[PDB]
């Protein structure tokens, strides 16, 4: 019941800014003592701010200070990371977590930050469809997209064992690409067709792809 | 200071052994008086108790229970007089002292005990005690029948020596010579309640208690009543006589003396007395010296937050989810607050659900506790006590174990953040066993504390040279080291100036964001429409008419965003239409209407 | 309930000796303490007297006089106090009994009797009494003194067996075993004021009366001073002391013991006590709950109405005319009202005229009387009690006789029509020899009464079997066969509706004289510009904007005589001038002045 989902992540230019949201819910900000860590890509676990707002106390790691800047508003029972003056090494998924007893207990599921001077590019997805078995293969192709991530589930979320969504792989052209794949029945072709659910948040695009034995 | 309280803790193990005989040691230094109850309970075998030697005097009971210490030096008590009684029963209550180079108590040594005034002795448990049932207890007894409440075991482990030769017949405190029993009723003359020898001529005065030196009421031993400045009275001072004598005007009854003034943390009664608790249909006025005093309300008594200990919750140990709600929007507390491990974990046994953090928020408009603040346990989420952010003052009035204002014990907060706490009116302060908290040795108590009497008792917190770095020491910005937590927003005094809550290098006078002014040490904002000024002062104030120069236009004696059109500064004034300069000061319009003017006028009037 | 009041008669034959011993049954039937005299007077010989059995303590004195029972059973009786005396000296007189098979108290049979606190004792003339010579007085006493007022006759017409052989010396109360007399004072050791046994343990405490079990003030027979809650204590509960204990708060001082807060009746004081009667510069408050207090006045005391037995009238025995003024405009009678013979007599050794009927229209205003209503006679005009038609409450804080709060005797009126009375506070009711009054028997004395001891006594009055025709019992549409008198204005509570002060059948809501709406079961009268319906509803409420339909015309929202002419609503609003329609709504006015309007217009503006 406790817990923090945290927004705000993307995409921003070398020098420029961006804030990030933790929303509470199961306690209060003001009372306890919130903490950020961030983790670029194939990296260790780094600690970057934190703050108890009702002491007043906000810390900083001499990596991020004075350019970061922690907070929080009491009335909408969040705190936020604001950060200025981004550079390539702060691109990183950054996680907010609640103090308790000595560790952090509660944590955010984490938003990414993608500091980049690439613009965003929307995914055409593309149909992989199974030919003439006992158990077959089908799945969605999501080519061609910036920044990181996108997420693709299968028929809202109903159908998840038998899936496998690949790592995305960078492209010569600078744009990302990954496959989801999905086993099934080899007697289930025709009768039962199955729909890919793309998203591509910084883009805004939601395509549903139905994919047919063809 | 010669007055003191007592404890109120009877048989219970001691909550820290380690600062447990220290507790003792500092409430007894120097008194004399016990407002209260006397309890030596569970002192180890070298405990150096010599910090007892001025009692002479104890109002409660007198419980000696519990030790491996050979012998308690009490000599010069004169009198117990039972206000309260242990058991219900008992002025004097020797209980278990060494187990079932040998521990326990050998003597009682009470050589100057001559009156206990109301309930019984009882003596039980002691292997090692000696010639308790030597005593002629009737003497002492202030009535006869004190004697049906009367326990004395005689089981012992060891062979006693005789009373010194030097004792008149056989009966003593102990070996000693000035050890034996001196008789003050059983062997007295004609009435005489207390006499000082066989003869009519030698009664003490009839408001004398333990004995005398003389017969005038200012040869009393202990007064029967009250002590008015060394004469014993039956009466604290409606006139008949037309005249006036010395012995200065009237006075306040506090404990069994009357006094010219109540005592630092007490209340003035209209009936004359001093007390920590007002009657019904009472309120508590404080007066331009800070002095309290309990009065009838002349309207209906208005609302009043009742803690724990007091009204409703007089019996509620602790504060739970099933009365936190009672607490919200109080400023002041009447009582006293504790939470406690089944604060938090909540009794499954009744419905009460297990008190949730963010609940706490109810306190977080307190400013004053009349009782004490205890802490035994709290939630693993909040660093601090910063829920009590505003809390200025305990006063002490009650104290919990009758010892303590305020407690803080098996914690784990980081750091404390009682940042606005000034005052501690009377009471110690225990803060031990909280395995992280930094911060208890950067706080000034001296100041906090009243009378000199008082201290804080701490260990097994967090080691001193271990709150050492940032987020462990106090503030560079803080003045004289003084914090109650980490950060520029936790120092007990500001080095510089402050910017709200924060402690700051400057304020923005010459250079910054927006420019200030400052006031008291405060640093705060000038008028928007102030123009900033090129390495000079701004502003002087916060008044859009206290600009050096304006940032738009300027409406005499105002800096403005634009020059007033049509505006009435109230009703039945007429409306107010300017224009501006070329330099930019706003003008006056000509002719009323038809060019109602503005620049070069409009028509519409 | 365990506490109850005593009488107040002395050795004054009863009023009704009829109903005498009902009178002492309902006062004392499972009564424990008596607050106030225990008289038992007049007792014939076959008299069941076992409700007197539960009786264990007495405030005043005890008068067992002039009966011809052969004993009264008071075995449980510890303790009389003698707050009050007999004969001003006396807390225990027995007097004449029995005639100067044959008649007469035989036995005292005190045998729990260890206390008389104050006063002496009075057994005269009492010629079939045996064994008061035999008791030891000065064991019972608690000063010696008491002895020199003591006066025992012993002239007897029997001779008397003695004490039964297992009597330990030969003083007992009467001819059984267990009427031996048990000695708790004169037998003691040293100090001690009252034992259980000649050994120095055997001490009652310093706070016991009477005896006791053991040494604790737990243990007592008795309480010297004040029960609290079973510990006896000196007094009823400003703190010296840093702590809280059991034994919840403060007390009220109500009798001899501390309660949590007064019974029924009383009144709380700021002094901590109940009573029955306030001090000077003081009123009465009545809480929300019911609950009443005296409280000292803010302002100087508003007018009050004293009755008999309070200020000027305290000595004062009935109202007469000398003092009927005095009563004009009451609503609230602090004290008592009695009406006898000489009041419509009218003595004439002093220049008092006698009391005219029509001057008892004072107390037509009356609504409350604290102390008592007593009526032994009444104007032969006047049917029945309507002059105290107002009267809700008699409180009965002071008794006729120490028992009635309301009596009725000899009176030969018809009816009562004391048609508002709903509160009987305490005391018994006498209505006794009216051999005219019906309707004693139609009146819900359970629902005047508070609690379940108290009763009406009732006898030679009209046969209630005779009171049957009209005129004789109730209005058909009296509720429950509740009523004051004859007719449906003298129902206690009303069947159908209230059209003022009469029952009703219907109100006329659909049909009817002028057309009525119902609001809380009254029937209240439309406004007089509505249109009565067809078997509908004519109105809501007795406003003109609640009509179904107007009478004459319209003026939204009113129904009005006429359109408005010229009128304004209040000053500095311009006059409003309206004309009807062909349908009957009032319509506005076109442009002002030359045709200044109506219908079609007219000039002069
Ligand atoms: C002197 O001490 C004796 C007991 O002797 C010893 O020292 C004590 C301090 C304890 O450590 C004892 O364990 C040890 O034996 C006391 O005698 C005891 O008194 C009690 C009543 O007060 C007797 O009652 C018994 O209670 C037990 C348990 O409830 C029952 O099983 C028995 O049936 C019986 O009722 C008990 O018999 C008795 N002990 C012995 C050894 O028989 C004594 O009270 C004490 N004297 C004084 C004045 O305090
Ligand atoms: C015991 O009783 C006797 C009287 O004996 C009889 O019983 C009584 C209860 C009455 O019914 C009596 O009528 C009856 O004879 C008491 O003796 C009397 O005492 C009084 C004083 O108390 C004596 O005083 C007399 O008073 C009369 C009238 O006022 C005068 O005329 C006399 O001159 C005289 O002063 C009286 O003499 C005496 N009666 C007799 C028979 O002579 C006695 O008081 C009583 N004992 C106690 C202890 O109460
Ligand atoms: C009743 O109470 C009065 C208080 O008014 C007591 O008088 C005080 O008692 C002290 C000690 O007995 C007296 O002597 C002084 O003592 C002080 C401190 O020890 C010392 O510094 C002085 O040199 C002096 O010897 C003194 O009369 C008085 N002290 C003060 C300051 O008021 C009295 O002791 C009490 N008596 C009874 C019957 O209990
Ligand atoms: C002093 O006053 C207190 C009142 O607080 C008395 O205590 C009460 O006394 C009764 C009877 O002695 C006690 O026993 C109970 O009696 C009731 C009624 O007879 C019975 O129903 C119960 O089973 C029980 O046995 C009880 O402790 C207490 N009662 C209540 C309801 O408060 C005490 O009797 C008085 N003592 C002296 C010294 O007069
Ligand atoms: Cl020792
Ligand atoms: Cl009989």
């Known amino acids: 019941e406790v817990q923090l989902v945290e927004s705000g992540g993307g995409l921003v230019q070398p020098g420029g800014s961006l804030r990030l949201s933790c929303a509470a819910s199961?306690?209060?900000?003001?009372?306890?003592?919130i903490h950020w860590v961030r983790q670029a890509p194939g990296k260790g676990l780094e600690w970057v701010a934190s703050?108890?707002?009702?002491?007043?106390?906000?810390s900083y790691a001499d990596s991020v200070k004075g350019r970061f800047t922690i907070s929080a508003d009491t009335s909408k029972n969040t705190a936020y990371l604001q950060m200025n003056s981004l550079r390539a090494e702060d691109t990183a998924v950054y996680y907010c977590?609640?103090?308790?007893?000595?560790?952090?207990?509660?944590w955010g599921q984490g938003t990414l930050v993608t500091v980049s001077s690439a613009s965003t590019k929307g995914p055409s997805v593309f149909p992989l469809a199974p030919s003439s078995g006992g158990t077959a293969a089908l799945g969605c192709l999501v080519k061609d997209y910036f920044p990181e991530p996108v997420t693709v589930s299968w028929n809202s979320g109903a159908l998840t064992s038998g899936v496998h969504t690949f790592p995305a792989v960078l492209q010569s052209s600078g744009l990302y690409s990954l496959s989801s794949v999905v086993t099934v029945p080899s007697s289930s072709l025709g009768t039962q067709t199955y729909i890919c659910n793309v998203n591509h948040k910084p883009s805004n695009t939601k395509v549903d792809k139905k994919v047919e034995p063809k | 200071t010669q007055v003191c309280t007592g404890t109120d803790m009877k048989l219970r193990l001691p909550a820290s052994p380690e600062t447990h005989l220290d507790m003792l040691r500092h409430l007894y230094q120097g008194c004399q008086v016990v407002q209260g109850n006397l309890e030596l309970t569970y002192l180890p075998t070298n405990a150096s108790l010599s910090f007892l030697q001025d009692i002479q005097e104890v109002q409660g009971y007198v419980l000696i229970a519990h030790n491996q210490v050979r012998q308690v030096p009490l000599q010069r008590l004169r009198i117990v007089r039972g206000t309260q009684l242990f058991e219900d029963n008992y002025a004097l209550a020797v209980l278990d002292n060494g187990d079932p180079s040998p521990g326990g108590l050998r003597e009682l040594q009470l050589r100057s005990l001559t009156e206990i005034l109301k309930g019984g002795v009882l003596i039980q448990r002691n292997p090692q005690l000696c010639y308790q049932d030597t005593i002629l207890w009737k003497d002492i007894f202030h009535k006869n029948n004190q004697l049906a409440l009367t326990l004395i075991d005689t089981n012992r482990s060891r062979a006693c020596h005789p009373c010194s030769p030097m004792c008149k017949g056989s009966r003593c405190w102990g070996e000693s010579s000035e050890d034996c029993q001196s008789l003050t009723r059983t062997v007295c003359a004609g009435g005489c309640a207390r006499c000082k020898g066989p003869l009519p001529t030698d009664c003490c005065h009839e408001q004398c208690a333990a004995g005398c030196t003389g017969p005038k009421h200012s040869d009393c031993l202990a007064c029967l009543h009250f002590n008015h400045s060394g004469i014993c009275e039956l009466h604290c001072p409606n006139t008949d006589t037309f005249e006036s004598m010395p012995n200065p005007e009237g006075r306040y009854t506090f404990g069994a003396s009357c006094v010219t003034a109540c005592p630092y943390n007490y209340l003035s009664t209209d009936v004359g007395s001093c007390t920590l608790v007002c009657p019904l249909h009472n309120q508590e006025v404080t007066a331009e010296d800070g002095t309290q005093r309990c009065e009838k309300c002349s309207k209906p008594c208005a609302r009043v937050c009742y803690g724990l200990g007091m009204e409703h919750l007089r019996e509620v140990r602790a504060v739970t989810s099933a009365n936190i709600q009672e607490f919200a929007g109080c400023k002041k507390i009447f009582g006293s607050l504790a939470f406690l491990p089944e604060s938090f974990d909540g009794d499954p046994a009744s419905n009460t659900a297990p008190l949730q953090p963010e609940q706490l928020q109810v306190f977080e408009t307190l400013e004053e506790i009349t009782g004490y603040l205890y802490i035994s346990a709290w939630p693993d989420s909040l660093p601090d006590l910063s829920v009590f952010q505003n809390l200025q003052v305990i006063r002490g009035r009650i104290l919990h174990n009758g010892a303590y204002s305020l407690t803080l014990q098996g914690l784990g907060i980081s750091w404390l953040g009682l940042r606005s706490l000034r005052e501690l009116g009377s009471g110690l302060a225990l803060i031990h066993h909280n395995t992280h908290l930094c911060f208890v040795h950067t706080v000034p108590w001296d100041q906090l504390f009243r009378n000199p009497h008082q201290a804080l008792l701490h260990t097994a917190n967090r080691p001193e040279d271990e709150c050492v770095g940032e987020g462990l020491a106090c503030h560079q910005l803080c003045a004289r080291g003084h914090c109650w937590g980490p950060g520029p927003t936790q120092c007990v005094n500001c080095s510089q100036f402050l910017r709200g809550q924060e402690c700051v290098e400057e304020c923005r006078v010459l250079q910054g964001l927006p420019r200030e002014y400052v006031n008291a040490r405060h640093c705060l904002p000038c008028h928007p429409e102030c123009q900033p000024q090129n390495g000079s002062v701004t502003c002087f104030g916060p008044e859009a008419d206290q600009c050096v120069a304006c940032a738009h236009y300027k409406d005499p004696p105002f800096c403005v965003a634009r020059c007033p059109s049509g505006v009435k500064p109230d009703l039945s004034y007429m409306p107010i239409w300017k224009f501006p300069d070329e330099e930019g000061a706003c003008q006056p319009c000509p002719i009323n209407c038809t060019h109602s003017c503005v620049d070069l006028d409009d028509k519409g009037c | 309930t365990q506490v109850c009041t005593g009488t107040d008669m002395k050795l004054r034959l009863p009023a009704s000796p009829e109903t005498h011993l009902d009178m002492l049954r309902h006062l004392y039937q499972g009564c424990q303490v008596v607050q106030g005299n225990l008289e038992l007077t007049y007792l014939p010989t076959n008299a069941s007297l076992s409700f007197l059995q539960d009786i264990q303590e007495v405030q005043g004195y005890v008068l067992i006089a002039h009966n011809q029972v052969r004993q009264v059973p008071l075995q449980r009786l510890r303790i009389v106090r003698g707050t009050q005396l007999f004969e001003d000296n006396y807390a225990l007189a027995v007097l004449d009994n029995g005639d100067p098979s044959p008649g007469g108290l035989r036995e005292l049979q005190l045998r729990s009797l260890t206390e008389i606190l104050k006063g002496g004792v009075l057994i005269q003339r009492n010629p079939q009494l045996c064994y008061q010579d035999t008791i030891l007085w000065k064991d019972i006493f608690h000063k010696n003194n008491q002895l020199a007022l003591t006066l025992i006759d012993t002239n007897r017409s029997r001779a008397c067996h003695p004490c039964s052989p297992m009597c330990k010396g030969s003083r007992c109360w009467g001819e059984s075993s267990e009427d031996c007399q048990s000695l708790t004072r004169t037998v003691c050791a040293g100090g001690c004021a009252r034992c259980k046994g000649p050994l120095p343990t055997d001490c009652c405490h310093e706070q016991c009366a009477a005896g006791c079990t053991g040494p604790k003030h737990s243990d007592c027979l008795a309480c010297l001073h004040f029960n609290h809650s079973g510990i006896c204590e000196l007094h009823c509960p400003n703190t010296d002391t840093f702590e809280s204990m059991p034994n919840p708060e403060g007390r009220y001082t109500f009798g001899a013991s501390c309660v949590t807060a007064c019974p029924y009746n009383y009144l709380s004081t700021d002094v901590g006590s109940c009573t029955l009667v306030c001090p000077l510069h003081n009123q009465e408050v009545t809480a929300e709950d019911g609950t009443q207090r005296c409280e000292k006045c803010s302002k100087p005391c508003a007018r009050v109405c004293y009755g008999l037995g309070m200020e000027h009238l305290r000595e004062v025995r009935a109202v007469t005319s000398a003092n009927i003024q005095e009563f004009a405009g009451c609503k609230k009678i602090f004290g008592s009202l009695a009406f006898l013979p000489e009041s419509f007599d009218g003595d004439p050794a002093s220049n008092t005229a006698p009391l005219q009927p029509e001057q008892l229209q004072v107390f037509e205003t009356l609504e409350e009387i604290t102390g008592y209503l007593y009526i032994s006679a009444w104007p032969d005009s006047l049917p029945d009690l309507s002059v105290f038609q107002n009267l809700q409450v008699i409180r009965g804080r002071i008794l006729h006789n120490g028992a009635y709060s309301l009596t009725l005797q000899g009176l030969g009126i018809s009816w009562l029509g004391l048609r508002s009375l709903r509160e009987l506070g305490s005391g018994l009711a006498l209505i006794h020899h009216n051999t005219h009054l019906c309707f004693v028997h139609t009146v819900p004395w359970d629902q005047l009464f508070r609690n379940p001891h108290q009763a009406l006594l009732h006898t030679a009055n009209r046969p209630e079997d005779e009171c049957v025709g009209e005129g004789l019992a109730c209005h058909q549409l009296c509720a429950r066969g509740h009523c004051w008198g004859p007719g449906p204005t003298q129902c206690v509570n009303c069947s159908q509706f209230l059209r003022g002060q009469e029952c009703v059948e219907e109100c006329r809501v659909l049909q009817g004289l002028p057309r009525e709406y119902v609001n809380a079961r009254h029937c209240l009268p439309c406004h007089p510009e509505c249109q009565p319906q067809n078997g509908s509803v004519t109105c809501f409420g007795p406003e003109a904007d609640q009509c179904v339909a107007c009478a004459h015309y319209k003026d939204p929202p009113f129904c009005v005589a006429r359109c408005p002419s010229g009128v304004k609503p209040d000053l500095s609003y311009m006059p409003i001038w309206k004309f009807p329609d062909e349908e009957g709504a009032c319509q506005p006015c076109p442009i002002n002045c030359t045709h200044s309007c109506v219908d079609l217009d007219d000039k002069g503006c």
């Open positions: 199961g306690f209060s900000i003001w009372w306890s003592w």
């Open positions: 977590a609640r103090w308790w007893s000595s560790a952090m207990d509660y």
């Open positions: 703050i108890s707002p009702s002491s007043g106390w906000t």
